[PDB]
């Protein structure tokens, strides 16, 4: 017999003790080795209610990635709350590794295995595990990168779709590669992302069809963000330690619903921190071909309000709350206490 509970979790990873890469270093000192033969009990005839939007596992992972970044990614200048902090800002090795989240004795993680589970409500196919699947702490906006893919069909997630101030998490069932490079050899910050056109448009079209199911068959319209900070208006992400801000106008513009889509990007040194502290300045880009190929496995959308009297619903790429990134991977899990 069990009950929903919150407890302090621990982590497991396959980090290398000899890696200088910051994720390996953190996990080496903060996590344990993974279980090579994980046990999983499938619970017959059990219905459990889940709520991805109010899950303490999310808060706890956020606390980790903040801790990791504080120890690993110190900027030259911190601009937090009036005070200014000047530190050394050496170039580090950066590549996220899978992190597992686990329950101590007396507790178990319940895992929803329903095919098209949207993250909230009753789950019919529930199993018990000690650890989650390995989750990379990939920080980004607009597009979710290198995440897990939806099993059956594309899934739309929201705490309350009727509320437009609530972020929408689109979960893809097929990866679309995004090829981002800062070439080696006029502008050392100029960079670009390359996406297969037909692949992306086909997927976006599938996303639109899925959105119609949730919005009474109204016509779905994509638009670029209207305002806000660059971290929101642009697909921001970190590649090899470098902060990339990419223009995604070509992605979200219902013209093609063929060829390679080349998004203009720039590596920024001065960043509004996702931690919510303030602003931070980092060192200029390293030399050489800075390249990161990632799977787009999800989209963060924000819906335009004031459309109730029209047939259109307008969706713009969003983000900013990195907890949403962890929700997209932690939705099928909740912690219960065993009695
Ligand atoms: C204080 C605070 N500010 C936050 C802001 N979010 C960010 O600054 C942010 O994500 N920055 C960011 C920085 C680097 C990368 Cl690679 C990706 C994102 C929000 C986003 C949404 C609208 C307003 N700006 S998140 C947050 C947490 O409390
Ligand atoms: C998910 O399914 C639940 C019922 O299981 C339903 O109440 C809720 O509206 C759905 N959420 C979304 C975003 O489709
Ligand atoms: C639970 O998932 C299994 C495997 O996909 C499926 O066979 C079964 O029908 C699901 N249970 C129900 C009744 O939704
Ligand atoms: C990228 O996507 C492909 C195709 O789905 C997948 O096989 C591969 O594991 C993904 N790589 C990741 C998750 O980094
Ligand atoms: C992805 O999901 C969509 C519906 O959202 C479905 O039509 C399509 O078959 C899925 N793609 C694959 C290849 O599973
Ligand atoms: C969803 O949001 C709408 C619009 O803000 C609101 O009227 C409604 O109460 C919300 N639903 C729930 C379950 O709170
Ligand atoms: C990424 O794009 C560059 C050209 O801009 C190319 O040299 C490289 O091969 C690409 N990577 C892949 C795997 O397509
Ligand atoms: C349009 O969407 C509704 C649900 O909103 C669906 O029931 C209906 O079948 C769709 N229109 C078609 C395919 O005739
Ligand atoms: C993105 O590029 C387009 C031109 O392709 C430009 O009109 C738009 O202002 C850019 N967006 C941002 C946020 O700079
Ligand atoms: C994208 O992938 C398709 C196959 O799905 C291929 O035919 C096409 O050449 C690719 N397009 C680009 C931009 O390379
Ligand atoms: C996504 O996964 C690939 C494959 O490991 C990796 O090379 C790349 O750095 C990842 N992208 C991001 C944003 O970290």
Q: Which domains does the chain have, with CATH numbers?
A: 1-339 (2.170.40.20)
Residue 106: is it exposed, middle or buried by C-beta count within 10 angstroms (0-12/13-18/19+)? exposed
| Ligand 6 center from residue 247 Cα (angstroms) | 33
The atom of ligand 2 lying closest to the CA of 158 is 13
Where does residue 144 fall: left (phi above 0), alpha (psi -120 to 50 degrees), or beta otherwise?
Answer: beta
Residue 173 alpha carbon to ligand 5 centre in Å: 6
Query: From atom 21 of ligand 1, which residue's Cα is the shortest distance away?
Result: 320
Cα of 239 from ligand 6 centre, angstroms: 38
In degrees and rounded to multiples of 5, residue 65 shows phi and psi of -65, -30
Beta carbon of 197 within 6 Å of any ligand 10 atom: yes
**Entry field: residues in the chain:** 339
CA 233 to chain centre: 16
Q: What angle do CA 280, 318, 149 make, to 5 degrees?
A: 105
3-state secondary structure string, 32-53?
EECCCCCCEEEECCCCEEEEHH
- Quick one: three-class SS letters along 82-118? CEEEECCCCCCCCCCCCEEEECCCCEEEEEECCCCCC
> Is 79 buried (19+), middle (13-18) or exposed (0-12) by CB count in 10 A?
middle
CA 49 to chain centre: 23
Residues in a beta bridge with 239? 242
The experimental method, as deposited, was X-ray
Name the residue at shortest CA distance from atom 1 of ligand 2: 118
Closest CA to 265 of 181, 141, 140: 181
């Amino acid at each position: 017999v069990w009950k929903d509970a919150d407890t302090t979790l621990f982590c497991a990873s396959d980090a290398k003790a000899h890696e200088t890469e910051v994720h390996n270093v953190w996990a080496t000192h903060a996590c344990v080795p993974t279980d090579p033969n994980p046990q999983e009990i499938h619970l017959e005839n059990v219905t459990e209610n889940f709520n991805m939007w109010k899950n303490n596992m999310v808060e706890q992972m956020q606390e980790d990635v903040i801790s990791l970044w504080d120890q690993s990614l110190q900027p030259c200048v911190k601009l937090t709350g009036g005070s200014v902090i000047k530190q050394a800002c050496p170039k580090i090795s950066f590549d996220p590794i899978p992190i597992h989240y686990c329950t101590p004795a007396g507790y178990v993680i319940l895992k929803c295995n329903d095919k098209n589970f949207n993250g909230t409500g009753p789950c019919k196919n529930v199993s018990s595990v000690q650890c989650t699947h390995g989750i990379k702490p990939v920080v980004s906006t607009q597009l979710l990168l290198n995440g897990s893919l939806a099993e059956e069909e594309i899934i739309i997630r929201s705490e309350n779709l009727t509320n437009n101030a609530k972020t929408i998490i689109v979960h893809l069932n097929k990866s679309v590669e995004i090829n981002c490079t800062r070439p080696s050899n006029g502008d050392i910050r100029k960079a670009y992302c390359e996406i297969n056109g037909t692949k992306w448009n086909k997927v976006l079209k599938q996303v639109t069809e899925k959105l119609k199911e949730h919005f009474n068959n109204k016509t779905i319209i994509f638009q670029p963000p209207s305002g806000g900070d660059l971290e929101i208006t642009m697909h921001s992400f970190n590649c090899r330690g470098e902060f990339f801000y990419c223009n995604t106008t070509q992605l979200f513009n219902n013209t093609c619903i063929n060829g390679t889509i080349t998004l203009p990007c720039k590596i920024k040194q001065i960043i509004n921190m996702w931690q919510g502290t303030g602003q931070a300045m980092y060192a200029p880009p390293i030399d050489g071909k800075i390249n990161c190929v990632s799977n787009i496995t999800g989209i963060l959308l924000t819906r335009d309000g004031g459309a109730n009297n029209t047939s259109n619903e307008t969706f713009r790429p969003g983000g900013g709350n990195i907890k949403d990134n962890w929700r997209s991977e932690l939705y099928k899990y909740k912690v219960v206490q065993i009695e």
